[PDB]
Design a protein around this ligand. Structure first.
Ligand SMILES: *Cc1ccc(S(=O)(=O)N2CCOc3cc(OC)ccc32)cc1
Ligand SMILES: *Cc1ccc(S(=O)(=O)N2CCOc3cc(OC)ccc32)cc1
Ligand SMILES: [Cl-]
Ligand SMILES: [Cl-]
Ligand SMILES: [Cl-]
Ligand SMILES: [Cl-]
Lengths: 9, 227, 227, 9
């Protein structure tokens, strides 16, 4: 499962 | 970094990101925080990007080594996993120390305070991923408590599409699934967050819509994996 | 790394590569070299992989920063480019120091000696990429001299398909094109190397054929870019 | 122009 990335990309 | 100007540290953090030098980026941002002034929105993102990338690489390496160690079960694999683990814990402790001295206590606006408490939850979560000893339950509870305070503020002070509110819910749902052994809570939180954001999209401009829907897709991706 | 066993350093270098921890990998391999024993074929590749990846990341960052600096033309971009440059030079100096104390002098077999002299040429080439001062010509000549000695040995002692001979010619051709301002020499060397290898492929097993043709494709890729 | 990689990959 993924958490939020540092940047929108 | 005590002898470098705050503005120069911020400028160099931006350069370090462009050069993909995230360890440098984190050191410049630590120096900026230690100037003692509050951080702007953009500066908070520089701090988070830098440390998220440093610890993310450590986590990926720890997982490779932990997999090798578990298959093996000489001392070398365990020793090297322990070395990477200690370095990861040190970075987490550094970030938590910046948040405790004194970013959180000086953050009064909901956006800043939620941002920092979400970070606090994240770095305790990363500690929990590698924890095994007498303090593992306490580390998990420290993550939970930080995320919960952030959630309480976000629900009172931010619309359901706010990207910080959404990212917080995303990460807290990951905490529930991966750390707290609460997959039903993780699924419920992701679903309710997604649905409440969907119903508020009509209020948003095109650029805000893009931000909110991008994070909603991450919630959906997790729900698809978990269900 | 003086207190760690040679065999443990080698084992940990292999683990560090799997975990993509190339700075650790290079430190473990530096420790192994400093035990004072010669390196096997596999160990030479670990040493090269580690430092090639460390300096490769520094080179990529230096190029990003140098591009920003040249567009700009405060002190911050130049200062930070200078910081990355100094760190790159330090790593190159470290590798060159290992080769000089005492890997090259103890290398008697053509395979080991060519491998180390190719590395020596490479690390002087990386120094030449960032050099500007009174010693820039001397750095270029030091790369040239190392590559030339390696070439002379390789042509006497190795078949034209030997992968070390091929990689040396590839890298020396890059030197001619990118450092020495000799694109015709670069093209000639790449062409002659490719053609002489092609004519020797018939002697090779399937696995040796794969190695030689893979490097021949790199020669061809450069020739296509240069012509 | 490309130089030799560290590994065959
Ligand atoms: C936790 C969190 C921090 C920052 C943001 S953001 O400023 O709105 N933003 C930048 C960070 O990453 C990001 C991703 C995204 O879609 C994946 C949308 C917006 C951002 C949001 C949450
Ligand atoms: C300079 C050089 C070092 C090592 C070799 S190799 O041992 O034959 N080998 C491993 C390193 O990378 C590599 C690439 C390749 O095709 C791209 C073929 C063989 C190797 C060769 C040259
Ligand atoms: Cl100041
Ligand atoms: Cl404040
Ligand atoms: Cl020993
Ligand atoms: Cl010898």
């Amino acid at each position: 499962a993924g958490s939020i990335p540092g940047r929108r990309s | 970094m005590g002898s470098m100007e705050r503005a120069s540290l911020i400028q160099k953090a931006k350069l370090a990101e462009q050069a993909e030098r995230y360890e440098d980026m984190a050191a410049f941002m630590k120096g900026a925080v230690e100037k003692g002034e509050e951080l702007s929105c953009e500066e908070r993102n520089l701090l988070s990007v830098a440390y998220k990338n440093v610890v993310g690489g450590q986590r990926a390496a720890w997982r490779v080594l932990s997999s090798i160690e578990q298959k093996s079960n000489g001392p070398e694999v365990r020793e090297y996993r322990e070395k990477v683990e200690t370095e990861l814990q040190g970075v987490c402790d550094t970030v938590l120390g910046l948040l405790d001295s004194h970013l959180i206590k000086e953050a009064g606006d909901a956006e800043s305070r939620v941002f920092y408490l979400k970070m606090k939850g994240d770095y305790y979560r990363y500690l929990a991923e590698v924890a095994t000893g007498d303090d593992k339950k306490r580390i998990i509870d420290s993550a939970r408590s930080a995320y919960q305070e952030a959630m309480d503020i976000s629900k009172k002070e931010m619309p359901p599409t706010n990207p910080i509110r959404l990212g917080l819910a995303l990460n807290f749902s990951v905490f529930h699934y991966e750390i707290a052994n609460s997959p039903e809570e993780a699924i419920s939180l992701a679903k309710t967050t997604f649905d409440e954001a969907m119903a508020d999209l009509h209020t948003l401009s095109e650029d805000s819509y893009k931000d909110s829907t991008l994070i909603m897709q991450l919630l959906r991706d997790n729900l698809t994996l978990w269900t």
